[PDB]
Design a binder for these strands. Sequence first.
RNA 1: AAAAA
Length: 595
Amino acid sequence: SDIQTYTSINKYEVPPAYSRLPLTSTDNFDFTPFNNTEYSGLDPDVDNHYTNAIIQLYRFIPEMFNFVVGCLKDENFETTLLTDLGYLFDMMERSHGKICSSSNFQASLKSLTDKPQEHLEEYLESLCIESIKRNMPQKFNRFLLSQLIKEEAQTVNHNITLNQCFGLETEIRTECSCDHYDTTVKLLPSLSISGINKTVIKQLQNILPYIEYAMKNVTQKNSETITQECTVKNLPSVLSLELSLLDTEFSNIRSSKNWLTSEFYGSIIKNKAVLRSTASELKGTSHIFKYELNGYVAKITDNNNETRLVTYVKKYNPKENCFKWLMFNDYLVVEITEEEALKMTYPWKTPEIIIYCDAEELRKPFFSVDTYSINYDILFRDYARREYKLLTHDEAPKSGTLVAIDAAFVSLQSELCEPKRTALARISIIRGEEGELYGVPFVDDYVVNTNHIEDYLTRYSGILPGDLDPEKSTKRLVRRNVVYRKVWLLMQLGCVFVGHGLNNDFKHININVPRNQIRDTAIYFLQGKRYLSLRYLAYVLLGMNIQEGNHDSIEDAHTALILYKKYLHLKEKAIFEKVLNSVYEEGRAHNFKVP
RNA sequence: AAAAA
């Protein structure tokens, strides 16, 4: 009777799987009663958390997934939105159930928005915001696919892959004079089911007539009342639909049993396109195509008159040749049956963005970035003065290379209660492998940021107000997209990270590193509670006085490395617990404080 | 509560 119940006995009662989920405050929070499968979820602690429902809709399209993550091998810094989506898609697959966040993706989307233009102006309206407006997910669906294709032509070895999947060659006939009209053809990424004037189809009905109308329609309203005829003669791989209907049409639509057609067939014969349920309903005079429902995003108005989005998704798993359906809440994930996934009888469910895909193309396996040859030439490049030596080609990091990482952050926004923002400023990675070059960093970069910073936390983070493009401390000022890649490549190769409180840093840098690569000195030196400060451990276990004054990540990363070496000394010799219980006992005497 | 910042 817990939250994972996705089917209530009555139609009016929304199951707890669709209810509002409480935000994760950051501290101890287990999602075992929330998600118990490989497919991860996205925490809702972002500005406009409705976009996560769309991200997971595109995540499970094999043609969409394999391309966005595929661009991660090449260096693509100018195309911000396409590569952050690849960082997100790659992370959600590498987590294998663990929670993920789209804060880095949404940060680029907000910064890109600050600049036809009316399409992006609306995307900012729903950012700082009844929490979901009307036809707003469809407008984001337009803006995302439009911005991805526009950026897909700016990568190296320019690709046109997203156009060959979402391409809708749409003819737009505008008739001003008789026998003298004007036509325009432009590639559209998705279909838009606009306000239907009338339903002339009383036949013995499913969604298929609605797609046929959007593919060949005649509009007799303009301004002069011009007659326009829009028709598309292209059947792409993936069909992206945007349902924008009326409540009168949304009430009669629930009576139609099995209105959401799972699989259908259809080709082009005349200047229009006809779609049938079975292949026997229409013998193809030419090449025929079969489309299956890859997934859709539904709007849910709960019993408390609140509203949010969910995502239904299929996946192949060719071992059994079946199809596993999946409802996706924020971090709630449930494996549901196909009958419950297609039911439109419930008055609280409203289809928003539907996606059909090619049958033979849906079965395509999801390829990871590890199957490619990745370009690691960012570590060896140059993208006050910091004393650090760049690595060399004989220092090639392998699976097991030790590195010391410590990041520094600044504050952006207050709690704003009835936590919303925090920014990355500077990270520093140190050499951890024994040798001549030991304990010496190789990247000390300052992340640039244009947003107004509330507090810099100069006492807790060594970032003076010198972090912006024109005026700065002349340090290694760098963009967030590229400094992320340096961290991402080390996790990709299998590098082991050491530091103090790494589980908190990676959450704000928006990257998930497995437990086999994280050596947190806070966890090793932890009693039952009361995590010890780095200044204290550097004083009670070593003979150095750190943290006196303003912090500095290159100092915290260097001492967190030798703490791991001091932990290894007390680990080889069976003294480990004798020191742990001694610092805790002596910690009560000094109250964890000493000048 | 504490670390982290």
